Amino acid sequence: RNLMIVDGTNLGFRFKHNNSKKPFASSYVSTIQSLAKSYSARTTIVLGDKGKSVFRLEHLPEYKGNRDEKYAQRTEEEKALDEQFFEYLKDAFELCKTTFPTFTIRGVEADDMAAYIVKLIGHLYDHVWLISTKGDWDTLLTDKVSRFSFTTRREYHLRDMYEHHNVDDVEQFISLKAIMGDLGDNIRGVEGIGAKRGYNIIREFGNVLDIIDQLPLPGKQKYIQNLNASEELLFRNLILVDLPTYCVDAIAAVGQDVLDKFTKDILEIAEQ
DNA sequence: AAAAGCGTACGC
DNA sequence: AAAAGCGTACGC
Ligand SMILES: [K+]
Ligand SMILES: [Mg+2]
Ligand SMILES: [Mg+2]
Numbered sequence: 001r002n003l004m005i006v007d008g009t010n011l012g013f014r015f016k017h018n019n020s021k022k023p024f025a026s027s028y029v030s031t032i033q034s035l036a037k038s039y040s041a042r043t044t045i046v047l048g049d050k051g052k053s054v055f056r057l058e059h060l061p062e063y064k065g066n067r068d069e070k071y072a073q074r075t076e077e078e079k080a081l082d083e084q085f086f087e088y089l090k091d092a093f094e095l096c097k098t099t100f101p102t103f104t105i106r107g108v109e110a111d112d113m114a115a116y117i118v119k120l121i122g123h124l125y126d127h128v129w130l131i132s133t134k135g136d137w138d139t140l141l142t143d144k145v146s147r148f149s150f151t152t153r154r155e156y157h158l159r160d161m162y163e164h165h166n167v168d169d170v171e172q173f174i175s176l177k178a179i180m181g182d183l184g185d186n187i188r189g190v191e192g193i194g195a196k197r198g199y200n201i202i203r204e205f206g207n208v209l210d211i212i213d214q215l216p217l218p219g220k221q222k223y224i225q226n227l228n229a230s231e232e233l234l235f236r237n238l239i240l241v242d243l244p245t246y247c248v249d250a251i252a253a254v255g256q257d258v259l260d261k262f263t264k265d266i267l268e269i270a271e272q
Numbered sequence: 273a274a275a276a277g278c279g280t281a282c283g284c
Numbered sequence: 285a286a287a288a289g290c291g292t293a294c295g296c
Contacts, residue, residue: 133290194277
């Protein structure tokens with residue numbers, strides 16, 4: 001049987017409907033049960049958000065800094081819908097704690113908890129299934145670890161790394177995200193370098209650490225000039241996007257005792 | 273011009 | 285509340 005790890009806040013938006021009125025807390029938990037059955041899960045762990053990553057904030061103070069601006073500029077109707085939706089999501093998450101191992105850690109993102117759980121107990125299961133729409137969770141794909149997205153309704157396997165993210169493997173995916181950044185997370189990338197130029201540069205010169213050694217790179221294009229002045233940006237971004245490497249550091253950032261407790265809690269779940 | 277990179281609206 | 289989301293289509 002399998003392990004299933006749910007990105008719970010991410011999953012909540014499956015029930016955001018501008019037209020619908022009623023609570024979804026019971027239907028939220030039933031959906032997780034249904035997913036558990038679809039992915040043959042003997043163990044399901046649900047993860048929630050609880051603040052911006054203290055780790056990522058320490059390396060990039062503007063991490064998700066667009067949030068408070070984006071939420072301030074919502075219309076009257078959007079604010080009213082959101083306040084209902086988020087009240088309902090809180091109740092859904094409460095009700096979920098009755099039934100499944102359900103984790104928040106203050107100042108730690110679900111991403112880091114998921115990455116750590118996979119490495120900690122994933123080998124005790126036949127397969128691990130990740131329930132998230134978030135594409136950078138594919139930094140955790142292996143032959144034994146896959147992802148399902150409710151928005152796209154797609155399954156994502158390691159063999160399909162290229163078809164999805166236009167890269168060969170996890171390391172290339174990490175290198176490309178570090179170069180490109182992520183506007184949604186307010187992580188600046190190298191100006192003028194997107195997916196096409198980024199992949200072309202990675203395939204020629206290698207992964208981000210190799211590219212930094214060779215700086216300045218040759219070429220007279222404006223985006224290469226921007227790349228050659230971006231050493232500090234590239235190192236910083238690598239720490240922000242390399243989920244497998246820094247997941248434990250991200251949990252430890254909020255306290256050694258928090259890491260200790262979470263480690264024990266996860267190992268106890270696997271024994272049940 | 274063209275593509276690329278870029279910015280934004282919206283469904284679930 | 286340093287609360288509170290993703291990918292996608294789409295147009296310049
Ligand atoms: K179209
Ligand atoms: Mg998240
Ligand atoms: Mg995104």
